[PDB]
Scaffold this active site. Structure first.
Site, PDB file in Angstrom:
ATOM      1  CG  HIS A  96       8.601   1.699  14.302  1.00  0.00           C
ATOM      2  ND1 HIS A  96       9.545   1.614  13.288  1.00  0.00           N
ATOM      3  CD2 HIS A  96       8.304  -0.365  13.429  1.00  0.00           C
ATOM      4  CE1 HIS A  96      10.102   0.995  12.252  1.00  0.00           C
ATOM      5  NE2 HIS A  96       8.705  -0.322  12.245  1.00  0.00           N
ATOM      6  CD  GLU A 103       9.261   4.554  10.109  1.00  0.00           C
ATOM      7  OE1 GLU A 103      10.299   5.417   9.983  1.00  0.00           O
ATOM      8  OE2 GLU A 103       9.735   3.128  10.414  1.00  0.00           O
ATOM      9  CG  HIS A 104       4.030   0.708   9.972  1.00  0.00           C
ATOM     10  ND1 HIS A 104       3.969  -0.334   9.010  1.00  0.00           N
ATOM     11  CD2 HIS A 104       5.510   0.440  10.319  1.00  0.00           C
ATOM     12  CE1 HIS A 104       5.668  -1.206   9.747  1.00  0.00           C
ATOM     13  NE2 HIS A 104       6.285  -0.566  10.102  1.00  0.00           N
ATOM     14  CD  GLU A 148       1.298  -0.874   7.412  1.00  0.00           C
ATOM     15  OE1 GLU A 148      -0.177   0.241   7.048  1.00  0.00           O
ATOM     16  OE2 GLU A 148       2.416  -1.274   7.124  1.00  0.00           O
ATOM     17  CD  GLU A 202       7.725  -6.830  10.148  1.00  0.00           C
ATOM     18  OE1 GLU A 202       7.824  -7.018   8.291  1.00  0.00           O
ATOM     19  OE2 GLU A 202       7.345  -5.237  10.403  1.00  0.00           O
TER      20      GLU A 202
HETATM   21 ZN   LIG Z   1       8.332  -3.176  11.093  1.00  0.00          ZN
END
Ligand SMILES: [Zn+2]
Ligand SMILES: CCCCCCCCCCCCCCCCCC(=O)OC[C@H](COP(=O)([O-])OCC(O)COP(=O)([O-])OC[C@@H](COC(=O)CCCCCCCCCCCCCCCCC)OC(=O)CCCCCCCCCCCCCCCCC)OC(=O)CCCCCCCCCCCCCCCCC
Ligand SMILES: [Zn+2]
Lengths: 97, 464, 97, 464
Positions: free
Chosen positions: D72, D75-76, D145, D152
């Site tokens: 994951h 893709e960042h 990032e 979050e």
């Molecule tokens: Zn995310």
């Protein structure tokens, strides 16, 4: 039309209305205490006698000059409601200029 | 313990002596004209404003079935032009004296008064006499007001409390003059004319039924001279057509009864329960005033309702039984009404009704002395607050001369209040409340209001 | 900044973006049917080929003259929220001039 | 009864032969590069826009506990620049094409695709291979990032259905690779760097695990030449790290269990009940698709829920048991999930759970031919709606090649769907649902959700 001049009877009537409001505000003890407190907080003194003298000593020329100086200053304009009919804002604040 | 913040004040209710407040209260002077009209003034020493007007011992009670509504229609018509002044002339002359004219029309009392400044006493006297004596009563203005009243009647444009109280007066005073509304029915408005207005004013607006009461900044002798110049031409009264003869001829009757006005999609549930109370001249009217103070009143914008002295206010505020309520004590010439009016909804209406009935019946058995001392102090303080406004001083002068026959001094009123104790409260509650018939009125969402037998059962206790 | 002039790369970018949106809006059967219906209801005919050809044939002079003629008309100002920093209603209409 | 309006249509469900649709459907052409990479295209006859991308047979299942969430984070980080293009150069090159770049990381499948016009296929191939093979993976961008992802994490910013399905995977496939979440825990996010990303890319993004699929306006042989020019440096398989060997080494396990995530002040209750489903290769996965169509879904924005042909939708819409719900059917390489997810309130949790459990268990005894025929027609029509969009056709090509090893013709899929009758639905539900353990996950206001023994007892009927 207020800026065009006030005519004697209107001036006397408005002076009597202002004097009646000023004297009926301080008729009761809580109203008089509130008036004294607000005037001392805002200014440092209570001057209801001076306010009555200023109301009584007002001429029509002074009021006409006051409204003339008022309309030169830029105004404030607020509308309300489901507004579906309104002249454009530029022509709204033009009639006093 | 704070030394400066904890002296002088404590929550223990003790009787207060209001005797030193009587040294500076002003005096009332009354002069009776040969017309029969009384002129009564009360001069406040440094007042700048004046309330003055004409109080009349007349109203909706003294009408008939044919002209019911004439006295209320008169305050629509009377300010629309006289024979000496037009509408605009009256408007300009009232505006120049800086005051406002006002009018109230009750079941038994009517007043027309002016709140002006002290320099405009004579002008206000002249204007009030001009509307009272030389009115036009034009048929065009009558037609211009009839349609507006008919529209507001068709719309059912009324306050909810006034609706409930009119139903209450109609069902408690069946087949007596006090059961009529001040507004009158629709048919009398649909068939009103100038002749009925002239006949009503000619019959009832006479010398022995009229008081010119002025308070504030006013001289008594000058008002006597002005009233003799202006109001000197009112007709006197025949002895056979006095107020007492009319009271004897058509007396009040109280009937225990029940009414509700049900609506299919309403939200509130307003209700009033009243007992037959005392007339104005009954000496039991002072304990009824004290009992009404003991019951008190409350609305839900206050947040200190749970710390109230009154047990009914405490119960309603703590359990949330009503959005607002008030205890009332209405006095008339030969009867009265005593009870509680409140606003609730349909799920809390029975519990509010039970709280009202249980607190009314409780005053016959258990009354503690602290509550009576508290209510006496609150009632005397409320009487002192009315002395602060000259409008209330003039209203009390007019009312007291019309309904007591005399100006009750403040010392006598304090002495009559101070003579009330817990035994007197128990006796008056036993006389008026215990095992008596009551009148019940409700309007709105009233499907869960209990019927008359539920209310009748709870006027007495089977356990004592 | 747009009315002063647009570069050829910027014009090519915007033309490719608009052509991509136009040819993506009619790529599906419901989108194509909706575009056909909306065009026939508004103007009486549907041809997105003419729209695409007009997009492809646009030069920088056409867009510059279009924005210059567009700035010569009346603006429109709409504000949402709490307006504690609304500077002037009349002056922002005269900024384009 | 209008003659022109009441012809050709009736509500009685009947089998529909979808054979004449297949004549106009395009065919798929598959080639294989020497490194094992497959290129498959389907050419739509009159198309202007084309979508294309790389489907990789990898995901969060094929990670370890030390590097969970590397896929994951890829893709960042993969769009922040390459060795030939900077950030701004990549931005202007993408926006010159008039299109979009998008990436999706799953548990067993990863996608990196683009949506362009038919004239920009080659530029899209070049930029996709440049992104995938020659990325910078700068440490400064990784640090930028990581702060966003950690903020979050600490704000708890997540979709509620995502939270429920992640909890359901973590409790249903516990002590299995499929039990991990895609995003990964806080510690692995806080302690990630370039080398784990590089090692994941070099280990898992090999030749035969990647498929280049395009659909729309595209030529096959030209795309083969571009793909051989661009993706030729992709390494091949090592025999010890094939997909089948990794599946055998670390298989999946299903445990009947319960989890809930209780919040002190939450308006909604979201719950999911899942059984052990079928894998992609299981021949009973097609009747599971028919059963998922039979259960259906509903949200309260639809006003015709009470007229639905699905019994569960009928019960939930008529009784108001939930705000929204949807039956799911997830397939994996060796296992899967099957059941109903829904959003409701705390006062309707038990009734919604009973509706779900009673509608699932009824399919083992009571299946009507009309509902089967209706659901088969709905399934085939939904399959034809995916053919209308280029993005769904490209995703279908990539997924079907990755999980079946081939491209299933639409005639075979229609023949497989058309072979399912009511007996097959009964047998599949008897195998998968009846008297089996299930996994239950919940979140929010879940104090009234029943425990595991309540759910477990309602998988079987004692009445039969
Ligand atoms: Zn995310
Ligand atoms: C005759 C003698 C009764 C007597 O001495 O009454 C005193 C006593 C005091 O009553 P009260 O203070 O005069 O009036 C009641 C209050 O207003 C308070 O009344 P409430 O509005 O709160 O409602 C109470 C209500 C409802 O009371 C209840 O809670 C239910 C009572 C159930 C009794 C009925 C059962 C019948 C046999 C089945 C076993 O009671 C009644 O209906 C009246 C008494 C019931 C008998 O009345 C009773 O409660 C009677 C006790 C029961 C024995 C009979
Ligand atoms: Zn009226």
């Amino acid at each position: 039309s207020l800026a065009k001049g006030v005519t004697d009877v209107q001036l006397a009537t408005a002076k009597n209305m202002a004097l009646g409001e000023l004297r009926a505000s301080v008729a009761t003890a809580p109203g008089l205490a509130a008036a004294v407190g607000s005037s001392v907080l805002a200014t440092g003194k209570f001057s209801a006698n001076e306010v009555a003298a200023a109301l009584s000593g007002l001429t029509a020329a002074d009021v006409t000059s006051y409204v003339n100086a008022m309309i030169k200053t830029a105004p404030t304009f607020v509308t309300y409601g489901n507004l579906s009919s309104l002249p454009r804002v530029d022509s709204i604040a033009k009639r006093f200029a | 313990d704070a030394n400066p913040f904890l002296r002088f004040s404590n929550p223990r209710p003790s009787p207060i002596d209001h005797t030193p407040l009587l040294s500076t209260l002003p005096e009332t002077r009354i002069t009776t004209l040969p017309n029969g009209l009384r002129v009564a003034t009360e001069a406040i020493p440094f007042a700048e404003t004046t309330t003055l007007g004409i109080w009349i011992n007349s109203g909706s009670r003294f009408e008939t079935d044919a002209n019911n509504g004439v006295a209320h229609f008169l305050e629509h018509i009377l300010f629309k032009g006289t024979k000496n002044r037009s509408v605009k002339e009256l408007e300009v002359e009232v505006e120049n004296m800086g005051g406002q004219l006002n009018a109230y029309t009750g079941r038994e009392q009517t007043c027309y008064y002016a709140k002006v400044m002290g320099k405009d006493v004579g002008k206000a006297v002249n204007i009030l006499s001009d509307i009272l004596l030389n009115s036009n009563l034009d048929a065009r203005a009558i037609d211009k007001e009839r349609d507006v009243i008919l529209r507001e009647m068709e719309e059912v444009n009324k306050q909810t409390s006034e609706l409930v109280f009119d139903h209450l007066h109609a069902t408690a005073f069946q087949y007596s003059p006090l059961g009529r509304t001040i507004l009158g029915p629709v048919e009398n408005i649909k068939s009103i004319n100038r002749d009925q207005l002239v006949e009503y004013m000619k019959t009832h607006y006479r010398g022995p039924r009229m008081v010119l009461a002025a308070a504030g900044a006013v001289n008594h002798d000058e008002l006597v001279k002005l009233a003799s110049d202006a109001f000197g031409s009112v007709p006197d009264e025949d002895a056979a057509t006095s107020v007492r003869s009319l009271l004897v001829k058509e007396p009040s009757r109280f009937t225990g009864s029940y009414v509700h006005d049900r609506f299919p999609d309403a939200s509130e549930c307003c209700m009033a329960v009243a007992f037959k109370g005392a007339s104005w001249t009954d000496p039991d009217s002072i304990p009824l005033m004290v009992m009404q103070t003991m019951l008190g009143g409350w609305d839900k914008n206050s947040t200190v309702g749970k710390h109230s002295s009154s047990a009914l206010v405490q119960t309603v505020a703590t359990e949330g039984l009503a959005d607002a309520f008030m205890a009332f004590n209405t006095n008339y010439h030969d009867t009265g009404l005593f009870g509680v009016y409140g606003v609730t909804d349909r799920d809390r209406s029975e519990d509010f009704a039970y709280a009202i009935m249980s607190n009314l019946t409780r005053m016959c058995f258990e009354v503690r002395d602290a509550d009576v001392a508290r209510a006496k102090n609150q009632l005397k303080a409320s009487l002192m607050f009315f002395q602060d406004s000259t409008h209330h001083v003039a209203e009390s002068i007019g009312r007291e001369l019309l309904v007591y026959g005399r100006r009750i001094p403040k010392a006598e009123m304090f002495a009559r209040i101070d003579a009330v104790d817990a035994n007197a409260i128990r006796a008056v509650a036993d006389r008026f409340i215990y095992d008596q018939d009551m009148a019940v009125a409700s309007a709105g969402d009233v499907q869960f209001v209990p019927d008359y037998n539920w209310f009748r059962r709870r006027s007495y206790w089977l356990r004592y």
